[PDB]
Amino acid sequence: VDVVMAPCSPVECRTAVVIDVLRATSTIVTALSNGASGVIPVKTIEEALEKKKEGVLICGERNAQKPKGFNLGNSPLEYRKEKISGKTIVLTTTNGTQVIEKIRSEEIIAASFLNLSAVVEYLKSKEDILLVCAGTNGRFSLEDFLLAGAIVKRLKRNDLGDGAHAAERYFESVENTREEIKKHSSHAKRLISLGFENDIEFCTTEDLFKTVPALVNGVFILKE
Amino acid sequence: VDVVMAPCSPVECRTAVVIDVLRATSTIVTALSNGASGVIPVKTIEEALEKKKEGVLICGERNAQKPKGFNLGNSPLEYRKEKISGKTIVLTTTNGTQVIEKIRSEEIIAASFLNLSAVVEYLKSKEDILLVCAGTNGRFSLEDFLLAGAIVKRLKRNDLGDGAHAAERYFESVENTREEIKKHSSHAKRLISLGFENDIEFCTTEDLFKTVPALVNGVFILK
């Protein structure tokens, strides 16, 4: 098991876990956990808007804010059952598909603090696992790294790559995940500065959900 | 101050610190500290060979070993004063130029455990700082992250980006630098398997030198 932060070239493993805590994977998990039919990650706003149709919502962000003409932004709190149940979500975030496209594997699942325990349980039986942290605009993402460390610690493996080892050690130094992220994540700060502090609290809520999204044919859906 | 591990796109900052402990920056620091006139990073083996001439040594590695036709490999221990003093070093490593090219900074220095305090003192009067860890074939490099954390700790700064904070916290978890690396660094373990244990001990030795190599328009020199 190993951890990579904002990989540049294709990464290859049997089971890949994409992590983008401050919102992308938190949004994906939330949307599916609240009834959405699927979440389609898309690179550009053009491609996003191009897929508009009934029962399909154009969602995402640019500068962390909902683009013009979009139905929803990238705040997990917007994805309530009453608004997305049985609907398909097209999701575009800054470099969202970019991290996903550099993954060569037999399966790609989405992990967040929201479904931490469920992801851990799904991975316990898996061999050759790569936790892929999206990072932020090419920079290190503390919250992604923190979740990776929490996952690694709970897998109780001794076969750990450099990234997994550092993430686990880092995780062991944390007394309060939520506070750690509020005080040291530059992206958390940006989100708070734009008025999304509630998202930080929601996204750092552990096991609110018990689902495990998997990318199947370009679409994140729920697996048994 | 922040830390980035194997950056994909050009990263900007007034002052940058390149870190490739298990060898490249340790090699650069050792070479210049022992007399080399400068160290020129080169991308391909072909390019390197074309720079051959009097006063110049072709050095580097591929799969951690010295390629055919090369004068020195990438073991800092080969860079003895009475072997490279006054000579220009042409250095090509698997991803050397790859990482350097991503650093959009006018001030770029090389750091290793070998010149740790010297690097810290140099950075004491620097506004913006980005510690750039080279990584290992695109993967996380534990030894680089550890040096980055050690540096952040000594800078005594409060303005830390995500990478710097995570590196400092990681550094705080380490009881013994050398043992941490020998046991958990995949590249360190690889080098040990290849017969370079001496490099692991040397490169993790703190402050053998007081120099601070700086990349000045394509060449690492001592200003």
Which residues have CB under 8 Å from B58's CB, separation 6+?
B48, B49, B51, B52, B69, B70, B71, B90
Residue B105 contacts by C-beta under 8 Å, 6 or more apart in sequence?
A: B12, B13, B14, B15, B16, B130
- Sequence-distant (≥ 6) Cβ neighbours of residue A131 within 8 angstroms: A1, A2, A3, A4, A17, A19, A111, A148, A151, A152, A163, A164, A167
Q: Which amino acid would we find at residue B154? A: R
User: A100 by DSSP, 3-state: which?
Assistant: helix
A128 CA: distance to closest CA in chain B (Å):
15
Q: Pairing mode, if any, of strands A38-41 and B2-5? A: unpaired
Cβ pair B68, B62 in contact under 8 A: no
For chain B, give percent helix, strand, coil, nearest 5.
40, 20, 40
Residue A138 and residue B10 in contact, taking contact as beta carbons nearer than 8 Å: no
A203: its two tokens:
């996204």
The strand pairing partners of B104, in sequence order, are B12
Q: Is B40 on the interface with A (CB under 8 A)?
A: no
Cα pseudo-dihedral A203, A207, A213, A214, rounded to 10: 110
Q: Quick one: tokens of B115?
A: 């010149």
Domains in chain A and their CATH numbers? 1-224 (3.90.1560.10)
- Residue B177, chain A, CB below 8 Å: the answer is no
Return the closest-CA partner of residue B166 out of B140, B145, B143. Answer: B145
> Which residue in the set A139, A142, A166 is minimally distant from B165, CB to CB?
A142
- Which structure tokens are listed for A127? 């061999």
- Selection from B111, B128, B113, B88 nearest residue B213 by Cα: B111
Residue linked to tokens 């980005």: B130
> Is the CB of residue B170 less than 8 Å away from at least one CB of chain A?
yes
Question: A146: nearest CA in chain B?
Answer: B166
**B29 contacts: CB under 8 Å, gap ≥ 6:** B76, B110, B111, B112, B114, B115, B209, B211, B213
Tell me the structure's resolution in angstroms, rounded to a single decimal.
1.9
Q: DSSP for B45-104?
A: HHHHHHT--TTEEEEE-BTTBPPTT-SB-S-GGG--HHHHTTPEEEEE-TTHHHHHTTEE
Distance between CA atoms of B93 and B110, rounded to whole angstroms? 15
Q: Extract the tokens encoding B59.
A: 């050095």
Amino acid at B81: K
Q: Which two tokens stand for residue A23?
A: 């919102």
Contacts of B138 in chain A (CB under 8 A): 4, 7-9, 11
Distance in angstroms (rounded) separating the CA atoms of residues A167 and B182: 18
Tell me whether B162 touches chain A (CB under 8 Å).
yes
DSSP B139: B
CB pairs under 8 A between A and B: 87
Write the CB contacts of A16 (distance below 8 Å, at least 6 apart in sequence).
A103, A105, A107, A108, A109, A129, A130, A132
Tell me whether residues B138 and A162 touch, CB distance under 8 A: no
- B157 vs A37, B160, B161, B164, CA distance in Å? 47, 7, 11, 10
Residues of B in contact with A8 (CB under 8 A): 6-8, 138
Is the Cβ pair A161, B185 closer than 8 Å?
A: no
